[PDB]
Design a protein around this nucleic acid. Structure first.
Ligand SMILES: [K+]
Ligand SMILES: [K+]
Ligand SMILES: [K+]
Ligand SMILES: [K+]
Ligand SMILES: [K+]
Ligand SMILES: [K+]
Ligand SMILES: [K+]
Ligand SMILES: [K+]
Ligand SMILES: [K+]
Ligand SMILES: [K+]
Ligand SMILES: [K+]
Ligand SMILES: [K+]
Ligand SMILES: [K+]
Ligand SMILES: [K+]
Ligand SMILES: [K+]
Ligand SMILES: [K+]
Ligand SMILES: [K+]
Ligand SMILES: [K+]
Ligand SMILES: [K+]
Ligand SMILES: [Mg+2]
Ligand SMILES: [Mg+2]
Ligand SMILES: [Mg+2]
Ligand SMILES: [Mg+2]
Ligand SMILES: [Mg+2]
Ligand SMILES: [Mg+2]
Ligand SMILES: [Mg+2]
Ligand SMILES: [Mg+2]
Ligand SMILES: [Mg+2]
Ligand SMILES: [Mg+2]
Ligand SMILES: [Mg+2]
Ligand SMILES: [Mg+2]
Ligand SMILES: [Mg+2]
Ligand SMILES: [Mg+2]
Ligand SMILES: [Mg+2]
Ligand SMILES: [Mg+2]
Ligand SMILES: [Mg+2]
Ligand SMILES: [Mg+2]
Ligand SMILES: [Mg+2]
Ligand SMILES: [Mg+2]
Ligand SMILES: [Mg+2]
Ligand SMILES: [Mg+2]
Ligand SMILES: [Mg+2]
Lengths: 69, 153, 117, 55
RNA sequence: GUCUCGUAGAGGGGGGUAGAAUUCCAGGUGUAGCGGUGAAAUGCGUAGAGAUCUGGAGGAAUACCGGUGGCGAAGGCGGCCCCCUGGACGAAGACUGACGCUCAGGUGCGAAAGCGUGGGGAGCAAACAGGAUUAGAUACCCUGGUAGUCCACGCCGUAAACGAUGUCGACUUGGAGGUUGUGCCCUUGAGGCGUGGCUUCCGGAGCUAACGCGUUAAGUCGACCGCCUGGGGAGUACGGCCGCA
RNA sequence: UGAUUCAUGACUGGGGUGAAGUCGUAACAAGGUAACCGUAGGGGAACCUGCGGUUGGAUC
């Protein structure tokens, strides 16, 4: 994330651009995940759980789009 | 309360001056429902303050209230972990209520002859930024300043 | 004592502290301040407000050099990532560049074990 | 076929920081995404592309 | 089962190399804190730390790509490059002519920890030490830290080594996806119509104590093997074999 | 001079049953540090810690 403040650009706008670029790069999440060691079984379990949750939520949304409350 | 169903209660203005501000002050000073006694004490103290200073009773009372009114206080906030003393802005009605309560407590703590004399001395000290309830406003402001770093909880 | 007018503010924003160091463009430090050293300890030391106070103190410490323009390099995930930059802009410096320099291993060494709290 | 020398084409599949963009974002087929990753790594080694934007 | 052409793949063995980052060493700037926690203290720092810049040494692992993605008998395999090398799949043929399936005993492979000899050692970290917490705290938290984790060769032969589901073959309604081949057609592209391999989720009949399984069966059948027979004692004792332990 | 089998032996190892005395609270809920498997080291005790593995983990 290298944000060069252009001429006549307000500092608040430059700061918001820098924040957006950092969020898009995802450096904070990377640091947080690298803070402590995750055992490979733990990493595999987490990835599988996330995939299962995504699929189940999509199926539930598909089912709920065809019903009335 | 939980249900948020509490309205507001109208308060009659005081006899001599027609000020709900002074009527609330009399209510705070009153004990055991002896409103006439509280009114007599307040009136005697106000006349002593008015003859001590050059302003009217209401103006001197307003000066004392301005000197005693706090702006930011500290309230406890318990989140995941430990409880923090978060500084919060005080609304004007609570500012007035706290100023009056502190003034009355300081006057009761004083050790002069009569309660009217104690109240007059406390009001004059408040107008000159001395004594109790002024030290109390100062302590509250100091605590808020010390905990200013927590003003986002 | 020599004028610079073109400096770099390095922000070291860790979870426990914020360190602000102003150097010239060649990396030679001119002054520094820290949130822990600006009268904050414990839970107060790791807040954005403490970081802002540290940034103000660093600006005061470098006031003699007459710095006008500042690049900014932020490193770390700490809460003092943006308050320091805001305070640096409010102190009068002209914020020319802002860059993230947080180190990321490309794999790297094994991190310490997870905490069981 | 993806060429590691085709820097102009390869630059469409890297971010500003130099990271390889996911195929789920670029709409690339998986078989070609693998070739893109190999080509980008070769170009990085030959210094035709940067590893990181802090160069 | 063999040959011909091609395809994808972290399949295996050997060698080289690249960039990021940590640690350590030296120097420049600079000055009073750093680090840590729930809060602290131990620890580090005026003998100049922490921070920032430059140069060097060294080990280990390969961000992004990356995916209920791929390969492999299982265990497992992830930067890039070269060398040696195993398997799978598809399209047209050509060839052999039941050469097949399963397998007691036997043999081979077999995560992590551990063992032997010789190396290596950045980071991490059993044991250990100190600081905390607590009634205590031989812990959980903090500061350190040795085997070990790494390499070569040999041993060990165990894991919730799991799909808690042996291998091989045939048969029996459907839907939506992933991945990898290949045929045909058109207005030629995120195109349409098929046809193979592997794979994820749902669900029909049927099955099941139920949960659920459901063409990758736990359905309907055949071939062969392994295994069970109330809980505890006990996968223990004794004996044998194997092992340096 | 061996083998095998029965009896017996100071002392010693763990096991079962009873009974509930002392010490803690390991497991069952996210059981208050998810549990469990193999292995290794440590500890009055249940156990704790490292390494890999499983879901037969709650919340998300
Ligand atoms: K090959
Ligand atoms: K390598
Ligand atoms: K046979
Ligand atoms: K060794
Ligand atoms: K080492
Ligand atoms: K350590
Ligand atoms: K080898
Ligand atoms: K073993
Ligand atoms: K499994
Ligand atoms: K297919
Ligand atoms: K096809
Ligand atoms: K053996
Ligand atoms: K030994
Ligand atoms: K005998
Ligand atoms: K005997
Ligand atoms: K436990
Ligand atoms: K549990
Ligand atoms: K264990
Ligand atoms: K003991
Ligand atoms: Mg830590
Ligand atoms: Mg606890
Ligand atoms: Mg060394
Ligand atoms: Mg081959
Ligand atoms: Mg056998
Ligand atoms: Mg090992
Ligand atoms: Mg040993
Ligand atoms: Mg060894
Ligand atoms: Mg060492
Ligand atoms: Mg430790
Ligand atoms: Mg077994
Ligand atoms: Mg396994
Ligand atoms: Mg089994
Ligand atoms: Mg496969
Ligand atoms: Mg089903
Ligand atoms: Mg059954
Ligand atoms: Mg045994
Ligand atoms: Mg247990
Ligand atoms: Mg317990
Ligand atoms: Mg506990
Ligand atoms: Mg527990
Ligand atoms: Mg055993
Ligand atoms: Mg221990």
């Amino acid at each position: 994330p290298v944000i060069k403040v252009r001429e006549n650009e307000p500092f608040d706008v430059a700061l918001r651009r820098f924040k957006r670029s950092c969020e898009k790069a995802g450096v904070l999440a990377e640091v947080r995940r690298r803070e402590f060691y995750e055992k490979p079984t733990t990493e595999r379990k987490r990835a599988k759980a996330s995939a299962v949750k995504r699929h189940a939520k999509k199926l539930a949304r598909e089912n709920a789009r065809r019903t009335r409350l | 309360p939980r249900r948020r169903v509490i309205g507001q209660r109208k308060i009659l203005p005081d006899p001599k001056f027609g000020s709900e501000l002074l009527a609330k002050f009399v209510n705070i000073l009153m004990v055991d429902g002896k409103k006439s006694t509280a009114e007599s004490i307040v009136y005697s103290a106000l006349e002593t303050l008015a003859q001590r200073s050059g302003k009217s009773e209401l103006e001197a009372f307003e000066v004392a209230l301005e000197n005693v009114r706090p702006t930011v206080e500290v309230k406890s906030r318990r989140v995941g972990g430990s409880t923090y003393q978060v500084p919060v802005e005080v609304r004007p009605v609570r500012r007035n209520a706290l100023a009056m309560r502190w003034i009355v407590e300081a006057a009761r703590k004083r050790g002069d002859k009569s309660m009217a004399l104690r109240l007059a001395n406390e009001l004059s000290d408040a107008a000159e930024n001395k004594g109790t309830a002024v030290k109390k406003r100062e302590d509250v402001h100091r605590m808020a300043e010390a905990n200013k770093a927590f003003a986002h909880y | 004592r020599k004028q610079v007018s073109d400096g770099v503010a390095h922000i070291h924003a860790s979870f426990n502290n914020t360190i602000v160091t102003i150097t010239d463009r060649q990396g030679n430090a001119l002054g520094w301040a820290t949130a822990g050293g600006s009268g904050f300890r414990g839970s107060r030391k790791s807040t954005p407000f403490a970081a802002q106070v540290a940034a103000e103190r660093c600006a005061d410490a470098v006031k003699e050099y007459g710095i006008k323009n500042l690049e900014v390099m932020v490193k770390g995930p700490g809460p003092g990532r943006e308050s320091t930059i805001r305070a640096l802009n409010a102190a009068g410096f002209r914020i020319t560049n802002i860059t993230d320099v947080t180190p990321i291993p490309h794999x790297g060494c094994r991190p310490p074990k997870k905490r069981r709290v | 076929e993806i060429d590691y020398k085709d820097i102009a084409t390869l630059k469409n599949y890297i971010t500003e920081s130099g990271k390889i963009v996911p195929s789920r974002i670029t709409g690339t087929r998986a078989k070609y995404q693998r070739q893109l990753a190999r080509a980008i790594k070769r170009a990085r080694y030959l210094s035709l592309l940067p590893y990181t934007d802090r160069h």
